[PDB]
Scaffold this active site. Structure first.
Site, mmCIF file in Angstrom:
data_model
loop_
_atom_site.group_PDB
_atom_site.id
_atom_site.type_symbol
_atom_site.label_atom_id
_atom_site.label_comp_id
_atom_site.label_asym_id
_atom_site.label_seq_id
_atom_site.Cartn_x
_atom_site.Cartn_y
_atom_site.Cartn_z
ATOM 1 N N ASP A 78 2.601 3.050 10.487
ATOM 2 C CA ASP A 78 1.604 4.027 10.932
ATOM 3 C C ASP A 78 1.996 4.596 12.279
ATOM 4 O O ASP A 78 2.268 3.852 13.221
ATOM 5 C CB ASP A 78 0.218 3.360 10.990
ATOM 6 N N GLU B 157 -6.719 -5.675 -9.896
ATOM 7 C CA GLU B 157 -7.850 -4.990 -9.275
ATOM 8 C C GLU B 157 -7.465 -3.571 -8.863
ATOM 9 O O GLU B 157 -6.459 -3.359 -8.175
ATOM 10 C CB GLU B 157 -8.384 -5.722 -8.053
ATOM 11 N N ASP C 205 3.111 -1.124 5.709
ATOM 12 C CA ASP C 205 2.289 0.054 6.039
ATOM 13 C C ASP C 205 2.648 0.443 7.461
ATOM 14 O O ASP C 205 2.167 -0.191 8.409
ATOM 15 C CB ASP C 205 0.805 -0.269 5.895
#
Ligand SMILES: [Zn+2]
EC number: 2.7.7.102
Length: 389
Positions: free
Chosen positions: A114, A47, A112
């Site tokens: 941050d 995807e 991830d």
């Protein structure tokens, strides 16, 4: 600091069109996600999700081959590109699949990291901003997490990518890793996690008496940076408003001793030395006569160790920003990070689409500042290639 926000995003369409026509590294990108062609339909069942103008996005996009992807990217000129899982069927046919049979099957293990998750230990920037001081948090995070993934887990194929603004991502791409279950991924996060708790929670690090090598090696990385980062740049013991935040991490019975020594000294370096000494003399257990660095280490970890969102890493279907995509709100490219040069990585000099498009007409990304980042990617691809028979 600064949020790096683009002042005028009306330039983006014409810059994206040029970037996707002449600079985006399609051959290397396909070499990555095709994974040597040794799993049938692996690229075709991936995807992609494209974001267009006005935060309108399309899910479950998939492509037959490199040419297809090239043509759609050049036709749609997306503001953002996210990569998701490899599915049981072609994503762009998921509506032909009987309900329940369309399933995400494989995906890279991703992290991830941050900057906003460190808001409780940054003195330099407001929540949405970054600066050269707090970027050191990312440098430490990369070193801490990459070493563990490489050494402790034996993961060989790790791609670190700039987020385009305030953080970094890691793509762990080993074939055995792409198949891991959500439960196993959660266990990996738990192994790596030492800072836990919300703003509700004052003390977020609690170490066991017995030190595991992961904790020791992580502390040892932090120790290389801590004086310059925490004591000089952040000045975490500058005054009572700031050093009270550290005292909230240690037992109340040593506050007075520490308060008085903080007031007699003159800078954060001196005050840290007193903290280490008082902490090393605290009796954690009135029973035994054992003393050590646990409090010191818990403070260093709370201020310097990465916070890991378990949801990001456990979800097989999680969409994550593509390497070499463009951050629409900053113009910065999601460039791969050269691990051998992690201490020289500056988000503020990451190429923008504006900058490299100017370089291009003054043929190929080799003419531009994007070139060394494509070479980092190529090394990652070569190591993947070497692993296949
Ligand atoms: Zn900062």
């Amino acid at each position: 600091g600064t949020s790096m926000e683009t002042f005028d995003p009306t330039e983006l369409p014409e810059l994206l069109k040029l970037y996707y026509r002449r600079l985006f590294p399609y051959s290397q990108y396909y070499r990555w996600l095709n994974y040597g062609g040794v799993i049938k339909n692996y690229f075709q069942h991936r995807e992609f999700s494209f974001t267009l103008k006005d935060d309108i996005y399309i899910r479950y996009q998939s492509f037959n081959n490199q040419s297809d992807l090239e043509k759609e990217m050049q036709k749609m000129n997306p503001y953002k590109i996210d990569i998701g899982a490899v599915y049981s069927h072609r994503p762009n046919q998921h509506n032909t699949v009987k309900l329940g049979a369309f399933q995400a099957q494989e995906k890279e293990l991703v992290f991830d990291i941050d900057m906003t998750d460190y808001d409780d230990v940054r003195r330099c920037c407001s929540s949405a901003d970054i600066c050269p001081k707090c970027w050191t948090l990312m440098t430490m995070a990369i070193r801490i997490i990459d070493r563990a993934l490489k050494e402790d887990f034996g993961f060989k194929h790790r791609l670190w990518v700039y987020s385009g603004r305030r953080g970094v991502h890691c793509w762990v791409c080993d074939e055995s890793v792409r198949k891991l279950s959500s439960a196993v991924r959660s266990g990996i996060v738990e192994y790596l996690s030492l800072v836990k708790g919300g703003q509700d929670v004052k003390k977020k690090v609690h170490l066991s008496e017995k030190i595991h090598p992961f904790i020791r090696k992580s502390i040892n990385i932090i120790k290389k940076y801590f004086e310059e980062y925490a004591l000089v740049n952040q000045d975490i013991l500058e005054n009572k408003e700031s050093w009270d935040k550290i005292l909230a991490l240690v037992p109340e019975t040593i506050h007075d001793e520490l308060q008085q020594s903080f007031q007699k000294s003159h800078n954060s370096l001196q005050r840290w030395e007193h903290l280490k000494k008082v902490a090393s003399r605290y009796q954690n257990n009135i029973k035994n006569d054992k003393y050590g660095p646990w409090l010191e280490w818990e403070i260093m970890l709370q201020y310097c160790f990465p916070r890991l969102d378990i949801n990001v890493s456990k979800g097989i279907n999680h969409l994550l920003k593509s390497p070499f995509s463009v951050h629409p709100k900053t113009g910065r490219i999601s460039v791969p990070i050269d691990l051998q040069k992690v201490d020289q990585f500056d988000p503020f000099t990451v190429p923008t689409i504006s900058f490299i498009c100017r370089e291009l007409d003054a043929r190929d990304y080799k003419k531009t500042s994007l070139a060394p980042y494509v070479k980092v990617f190529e090394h990652f691809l070569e190591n993947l290639d070497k692993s296949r028979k």
